[PDB]
Amino acid sequence: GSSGSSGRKKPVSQSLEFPTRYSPYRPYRCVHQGCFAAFTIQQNLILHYQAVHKSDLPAFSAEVEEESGPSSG
């Protein structure tokens, strides 16, 4: 006897969402009194402390995963 089979898989078109290749303002700014550095991404900001002051960011919070932020108005 004899027989065959078919198979395939189309790729995925992964696009970007970033608004601008680079942001002018940065919400994250080193607290260290005397450090002119900042990183848009919270992550890229972590290493900065380990690359400059070879340390990790401070602690100003506790085991909490809530928002309860001041909604508009």
| Residues near Zn ion (CB under 5 A) | 30, 32, 35, 37, 52
Q: At its nearest, how many Å lie between Zn ion and the CB of residue 38?
A: 9
Q: At its nearest, how many Å lie between Zn ion and the CB of residue 27?
A: 15
Report d(CA 27, CA 19) in Å as an integer: 16
Question: After which residues does the chain break, using C–N > 2.5 Å?
Answer: none
Q: At its nearest, how many Å lie between Zn ion and the CB of residue 36?
A: 8
Q: Of the two residues 19 and 34, which places its CB atom closer to Zn ion in the complex?
A: 34
Structure tokens at 48: 């900065």
Give me the residues paired with residue 38 across strands. 29
